[PDB]
Subunit: 148 residues, 6 copies
């Protein structure tokens, strides 16, 4: 099944939104398969910093090294990459709809709470950067019987 | 005043969303005039199964006979048929907006939480199928003085 | 498994708390097996009005005939009779703890939101008064695998 | 920084939504700089009643004199005027999206819960009508360090 | 009817709890009759600073002059003084029960979110210090018909 | 500052309560310093299984090897060990107060949602079993300025 990478940015950590964000994905019916609180390091940020022109997230990673920890997650489910983008709302919170995460919680594009992968291709790459294979848990969620 | 038929599907029952769904319609200001937990039977499902080509709900009813109870409701208020459709969101939860019931709680079209009437004409028919006249309560809701 | 009778009084109906109350019992893990919105009639209230001295609920029933509908429910689970009393809080809302239903939502003993059976013996009697056997649904709740 | 005027109408007061509305603006990250519960008087309503043809709010003010108190607020933040309009939803609650204040809580345009300024120009005027300079508090909100 | 004084301390302001706190008193069924965001001044704090030995709140007032605004409220209802104390929880949040305001939101006695009057006598005095008679609104709350 | 170990048991995972539980500790004002979703292995469970007579948690660990992942957390703050016990409620959910985690969400002692350390001494030991030193993040939470 499809997997996406989602990360609460240091501002979401500081403003105490981790629980609220996780709850939204849990109530939606998606399955949590990896989660850790962690510090972004130069080693992580350097891996892909050369690609920051085409992918600005790899630029933001550099800023996170000195700003506070992030909460990194891998979620699994049908159409999760695009659906999670929908649930986050537009990147600029001024443009994000009420009911979305950025819409409800964010003010500026600088401090916009959350990142999620923009495509399947970037999801595979971002998961590989933040998680070792053995940190991803494979289990069956019983309630999937009423979700699918 | 206008009335619509709303039904929590067996998946909404199983996933424990009845209270959350009722609360949304209560906070909106609509008035609850009929409600029962019930099993869909062959007698109910056969009434209109011949019309399943033009109305797919009458097809789904057949599946509910063996899958678990539903929570059937009649709500009353100004423009309630169309507004309740708005609040449920698109039939396919991938297309439903965050903030709507399907948007917040559903993943697949198969298990999409809730049905509501698509028109006044189908509301009258669906109410008549699920409720006897004497199961609908006529009462005045005092707070209507500040809703209308 | 054990069953209790719970009823949202006309004041809980009017103040739009049905959804919130159902949600609390759903999140707790109890199983909903009967539910209807209904009007209390003289026939229902007369059945046991002679016993109102020893059981004051049968007195209150008389008042409900002219005051508005009630939302009657049957919940099932381990120790549900006593646990539901715990969750409702003390009968007098001034004495009820915050976190309980009466504690969070009620002010006076006259308008104290909710009734639930005080014992197994009164649960069996109250269920029999409000529900016919065929209005109680027997089904398996999949999530019980993680509740018990 | 930018400021807007927001007012819970007498219907939002009566239906007990003041806390819920304030919480939405607090979670968004905006800063509360003025707030009072107050009665609209003839003196307030007459100030601009001549302009009611071009601005219908000044018409509604007249109706509020005899209908109940309002809860008047001044919020501050980047793009707060337009963002607060977004969060309130369309003026007609039938047209308002779920997730917005009118979308979630209102039924009719007559009783549509909340007013907010439609532009910076009307924000400056409305703030001046409802608040004296000394009722507006100037303070620093520490969490702004993670909002901006 | 009985009235109490409640005040969100500068820490509750800063941590963005005003809405959540108001909502709890609104859902309980109490009636809001005065509310303002305000700065504590030397003139207010000096009025009763001589009594700080017997009443430590008059000591805390002095600290608030330089620390940030407070949100001052007057609530009305049956038994509101003692009930509001119940809802706030023990003064020391370590001793406060979950479900109470201090229990859910506070860590230390220094930053314990909220003050409310300890008796009717102190309620009358504190209301007189923070509110002029004309800032208290007298109105009828329709829903009181289902609360009392 | 003081640290405790908290773990959402496989039942809390399966019933989709991770977000709700994290949110309660975040709103309280505690600081999250370690978090991971993980599978309990024989190597982890064997470390202290010999001590299961005096500490029954080390017995439960064995059961978790084959039952599903757990969500392990380290929280930091003043008096966090005892306060977190308070917030969880009694071990037997029938005895737990409404407003506590077990009180609101659990039915049986077998499936009682959450574990937390019973003392400082057991907190130090349990943290060492589940987390390497480098998985614990040391950072400053700005809002601590208004919590302490």
């Amino acid at each position: 099944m499809e997997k996406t990478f989602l990360m609460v940015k240091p501002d979401g950590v500081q403003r105490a939104f981790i629980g609220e964000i996780v709850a939204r994905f849990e109530k939606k019916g998606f399955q949590l398969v990896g989660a850790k609180l962690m510090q972004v390091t130069p080693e992580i940020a350097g891996q892909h910093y050369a690609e920051h022109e085409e992918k600005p997230f790899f630029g933001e990673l550099v800023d996170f090294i000195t700003s506070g920890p992030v909460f990194a997650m891998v979620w699994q489910g049908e159409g999760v990459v695009d659906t999670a983008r929908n649930m986050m709302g537009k990147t600029r919170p001024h443009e994000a709809a009420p009911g979305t995460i950025r819409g409800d919680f964010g003010v500026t594009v600088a401090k916009n709470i959350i990142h999620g992968s923009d495509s399947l291709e970037s999801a595979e790459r971002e998961i590989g950067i933040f998680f070792k294979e053995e940190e991803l848990v494979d289990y069956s969620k019983l309630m999937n019987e009423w979700i699918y």
